[PDB]
Subunit: 154 residues, 4 copies
Amino acid sequence: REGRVFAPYSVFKGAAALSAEPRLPTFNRLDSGGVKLNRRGVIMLTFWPSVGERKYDWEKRQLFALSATEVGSLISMGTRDSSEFFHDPQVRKSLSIKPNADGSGYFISLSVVNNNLKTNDRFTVPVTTAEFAVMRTAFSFALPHIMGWDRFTN
Amino acid sequence: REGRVFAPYSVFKGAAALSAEPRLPTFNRLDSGGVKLNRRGVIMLTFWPSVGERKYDWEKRQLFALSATEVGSLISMGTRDSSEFFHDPQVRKSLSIKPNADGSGYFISLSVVNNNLKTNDRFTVPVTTAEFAVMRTAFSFALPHIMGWDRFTN
Amino acid sequence: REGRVFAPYSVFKGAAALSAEPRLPTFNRLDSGGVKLNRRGVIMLTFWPSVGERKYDWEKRQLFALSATEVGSLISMGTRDSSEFFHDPQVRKSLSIKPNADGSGYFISLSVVNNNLKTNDRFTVPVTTAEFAVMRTAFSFALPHIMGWDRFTN
Amino acid sequence: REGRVFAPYSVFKGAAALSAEPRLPTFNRLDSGGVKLNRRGVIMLTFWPSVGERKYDWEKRQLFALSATEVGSLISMGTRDSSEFFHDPQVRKSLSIKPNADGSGYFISLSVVNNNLKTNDRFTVPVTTAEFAVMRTAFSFALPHIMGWDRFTN
């Protein structure tokens, strides 16, 4: 617990909020010496809905984890590019990132569907060019770290 | 005080000078273990006016702090892009960055207005493409640091 | 052996798999003080063939080392760019990276030829834009490290 | 002397060779605590002439130091961009970087003139796109370091 860090980048908007934070990979120590990557690193996204003016319901939050490759998708997006990721379970989630009309930003939307319970939720947060540039730059910085490549240093 | 660092990037021009330097975020240590970001990091800009040939008046300086998102705005600017940031108080400040005619650089201008005292100041510094490229590269380097994301490392 | 790190980025596809990992340079310590780069750093690529559905034959793997300059070639590639590297021995190897039809990714192909033994092998792995973006970002991160330039720090 | 590092990036060509290496800034420690940048950092270029097939004369080398701003110029260069830097003394030096005909690389040329002694030297090294990409990526990595901004970290 001593090694925990909390420093999300968060964007609060009218209908919902979104936060992003890296999760580092885990490594296994080898008997013969050295380490080897174990559990993958991700960039974790958290979405939660507004319930009023500048008020949000943290209890209804839903998460979506971006793999290294999914981060690669996001950082290579141009002004007018779109993408969608589908994660299989019961509950199915999908994350879409689509440009706004003006190319002055995007809509980032998390869909959460439980067909069995007929429950259906969607959390959408607009992000400006400036905000998405923070995401690209920060996620690009984090990528080598979530891949474990920061361990290759002189 | 032992941890202070002074290493501004500065540009000195005919009517004014400008300097830029990161300010790191502060963190709070958690009782249960780990840390959490407290006070935001910024890139601090300082402007001061010329009073003669290669002479400037440091006593009349005025500051403007760039948030992570405002840095995102600056680093994603193309050759012909413009931007303006407004900071509310009494005294109101605004920062504009506009391309020059030739697309060989920009004008970075700080406006400081105190309507009550009818005082009105403006400090403008031209910056070349090369100088703005230093800013983009350096501010991009600093961004993960002012966000606290440098704490996520293996 | 205590300093070994294993954290490849790997892409598994229908006919073959590919993995990439940096190899750091070696340095020599100088009698008068300080260090000087000795053996070059590279980004090592490993290719091996499929033998069935999600099954591959590690025993038939073949390697190809990218120099700093060859990494420079890869990271500066645009969507529609191609490249080929030839490495002299007996056995000759060549590595090609060519865009797919749609510009939605590339084919990375390792050729291994032994004219004397008339043996002839080729291992080809398709990589998406997102996967190649991971490679560009990660290899760019690693470049200063494999060059030894990470040693120039305050 | 214990802190010296030697790890140039070097390009050897038909008529001349060129090497590049960062030089870190110096800092002064403050009585009240903390440090402040003193002597500027640069990227140092070294050129020397060929005297035969894969043979060069190190004794006739000439140097040229790139300031942070001059590095900004280099890293922001597009395929078809040119630049020239002039350094005043006695001896005057100028450094030009011009694209080749095909946009497949550049010519980097150091001029050294001593009008008084009527001595006149020029050392020119062609650099491929891949080689210049190493320079851009490596110099961009080094820039925050030569500016002293690597000292702003959590």
